[PDB]
Amino acid sequence: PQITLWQRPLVTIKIGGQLKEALLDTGADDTVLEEMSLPGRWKPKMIGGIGGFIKVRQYDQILIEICGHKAIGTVLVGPTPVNIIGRNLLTQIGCTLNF
Amino acid sequence: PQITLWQRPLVTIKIGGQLKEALLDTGADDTVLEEMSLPGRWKPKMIGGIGGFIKVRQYDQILIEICGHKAIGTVLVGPTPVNIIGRNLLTQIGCTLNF
Ligand SMILES: C[C@H]1CC[C@@H](O)[C@H]1NC(=O)[C@H](Cc1ccccc1)C[C@H](O)CN1CCN(C(=O)c2cnc(N3CCN(C)CC3)c(Cl)n2)C[C@H]1C(=O)NC(C)(C)C
Residues whose beta carbon lies within 6 Å of some atom of ligand 1: A 23, 25, 27-30, 32, 47-50, 81-82, 84; B 25, 27-30, 32, 47-50, 81-82, 84, 86
Helix or strand or coil: residue B80?
A: coil
Q: Where are the beta strands (DSSP E) in chain B?
A: 2-4, 10-15, 18-24, 32-34, 43-49, 52-66, 69-78, 84-85, 96-98
Q: Which residues contact A38 (CB under 8 A, 6 or more apart)?
A: A16, A59, A62, A75, A77
Query: Amino acid identity, residue B48?
Result: G
Task: State the Cα–Cα distance between residues B16 and B37, nearest whole angstrom.
Answer: 9
Question: A15 near A64, Cβ under 8 Å?
Answer: yes
Count: domains in chain B: 1
Measure Cα distances from B59 to A17, B33, B42, B48, B73 in Å.
45, 11, 5, 17, 9
Task: State the Cα–Cα distance between residues B42 and B37, nearest whole angstrom.
Answer: 11
Is A60 assigned a catalytic role?
no
Q: Identify the CATH number of the domain in which residue A87 sits.
A: 2.40.70.10
**Chain A touched by B9 (CB under 8 Å):** yes
Helix or strand or coil: residue A75?
A: strand
Calculate the CA dihedral of residues B65, B5, A90, B84 and round it to 10 degrees. -40
Element (H, E) at A66: strand A53-66
Interface contact A95-B99, CB threshold 8 A: yes
Measure Cα distances from B20 to A60, A70, B12, B78, B82 in Å.
35, 37, 6, 15, 10
Ligand 1 centroid distance, CA of B46 (Å): 12
Q: Which domain holds residue A10?
A: 1-99
Which experimental technique did the depositors report for determining this structure? Answer: X-ray
Element (H, E) at A32: strand A32-33
Task: State the Cα–Cα distance between residues A21 and B63, nearest whole angstrom.
Answer: 34
Nearest protein Cα to ligand 1, atom 47? B28
Q: Resolution for this model in angstroms, one decimal place?
A: 1.9
Element (H, E) at A56: strand A53-66
Strand pairing partners for B10?
B23
